[model samples]
Target chain A: TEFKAGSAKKGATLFKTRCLQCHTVEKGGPHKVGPNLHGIFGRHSGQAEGYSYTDANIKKNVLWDENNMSEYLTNPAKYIPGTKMAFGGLKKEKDRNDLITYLKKASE
Target chain B: TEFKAGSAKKGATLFKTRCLQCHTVEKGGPHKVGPNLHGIFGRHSGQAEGYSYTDANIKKNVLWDENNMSEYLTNPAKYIPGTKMAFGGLKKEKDRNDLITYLKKASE
Candidate 1:
């Protein structure tokens, strides 16, 4: 799948609106409903320390990447059945791309 | 802990009221919000076939004995952190005992 360049600037607004309640992107950020997203791109699913995860999530054992992240942002429960996340998902391709871009840059 | 004998007859009524919406006790019964509970006793948590379970449940990996069942009925999330089951808990010793009795007998 081809990915167009996304705006990390717009991604920040999207993150504040949609993801800030559950996640934090800064290094050493506290865990909320979801784990902090620092260094998330290459991490294994459910490997974030001090956060409990559903068995389905750990069992999936995916390495987070742009492709996987796009799919996951579109539908979290569908990606990992039995996951406890209550998110409905980001539907727009552009929104996902921007959010992903923001995540990659801000989480570092 | 001292064990008191539970009334399977009373247990049936309790199960119908509290657990029928989420679980089934009969063999070959259909899965509801939770899995059909046939042969639940002595089985490992999350081992019910065709059901997706949380990682915390599989990691706990305890055989479903009377004591464990009792505790789980008291508080599911506390017993298995990250579990997706939404039931608050039974919260009474006698109620749990009776429910456990019903499950043990009916599940077989």
Candidate 2:
């Protein structure tokens, strides 16, 4: 599917509302519940500094691509059991697509 | 001000990303961390059953409204110190507004 220009902007707002609580994008933002998401797309997993990841996540080898992120966000535990991310999956596909677009744009 | 249909949908995505970790909306959904938020707006704070609320929240008497939820989401610690919610807060006003809209619509 072709990327929608408007969805990125919408995704930005969506990120602020939803994703920001756990993930941070700013260089020095405090690590609250999750890692800072700066440069997440295409980045190696378990690379964020000082953030302790779940043993399951640390043992697995994965690079964050659109497909991986989409599946992960849809159902976190299903993707990786024992991972600390407590968010339930995104029920709607469009929202997940838009959120993935948002994350890509923001991390770029 | 008028509600934005687009934003509410976006907020559903947002809620999934940010809030669902602790709060549940669907009836009989797992009460993982926070209370079920099926009827949060206009409901008294600390009223969700089987979920242990913070002493600070239980001691206070307040209702969930747009204004209160906005302030609470912006800074959970500041609004109600020692609350159990681990989320830092939603920093943007528009995101908070959209999230409130989504929660209200979903609960109603």
Candidate 3:
């Protein structure tokens, strides 16, 4: 199938299944191993208060927007080499698209 | 390959990558989406203080030992139907063995 963007509804469910273990999208949510993802888009990496990030993440210093995030979600360690996220990465582009859509909506 | 139990060393890595997101194996560690797993071996399911458990878990009422955990980690929802845990299950016996070894050792 040709590549297409994913749906937020599906993305929400996907987050619960995959990312919710380490991350929360709700505003003012507590950080787990991963940071709370509220306001992720347009924000610089490693900005979440009280969450410890790796040197690579702070050094990379990229904004967490759609394009950058799509790649990062695919391979978090690859994007930020020293990241301690421990996720194996989302292999499917469709899944990434869906997750990004959900994140953008939920982090508001 | 003949079936063999996993190593605590490898299981420690597996736990960091897989289980640390939602769980903490350290004694007295705070609960995440899942409960703290300290002293998990031989403990009853859904017995961790301060973490609310699904009725399915409390009703099933099983001990958390090597044999039971092996099956539960393979497929949590299958082991306890109606569990709110979102993990998709570890497909490999070796991985489960390793994780259980780590859990048994670390939760002390």
lDDT digits (tens) for residues A1-108 of candidate 3: 111334445445545666678877777888987888777766788888778876766568887544444434433533344222322233333333333233222222
Count steric clashes of candidate 2: 0
On residues B1-108, what C-alpha lDDT tens digit does candidate 1 reach at each position?
Answer: 422335445445545555677777677788887787777766778878888866666567778655545434433434344232122123333333333233222212
| TM per candidate | 0.38, 0.36, 0.37
Model 1 chain A poorest 10 in a row by lDDT: A82-91
lDDT of 1 by residue, A30-102 (tens): 9987777777766777877788876666557788665555544543433344232122123333333333233
Write the number of the candidate with greater DockQ, choosing between 1 and 3. 3
Candidate fnat values, all: 0.00, 0.01, 0.00
Give the clash count for each candidate. 3, 0, 0
Better of 2 and 3 by DockQ: 2
Residue-level lDDT tens digits of model 2 in B1-108 = 211123444655676667667766765655776777765555788877677776767557777554444434433433334222234333433444443333222222
Task: Give the runs in model 3 whose Cα sits over 4 Å from its true position.
Answer: A1-108, B1-4, B79-108
Count backbone clashes in candidate 1: 3
> Taking the tens digit of each residue's C-alpha lDDT, what string does model 2 give over A24-69?
6766666767887665656688777778776656557678654444
Model 2 chain A poorest ten-residue lDDT run: A1-10
Sort candidate 3 into its docking category: incorrect
Q: Judge candidate 2 against the unseen true structure and give its global Cα lDDT, from 0 to 1.
A: 0.51
Candidate 3 global TM-score? 0.37
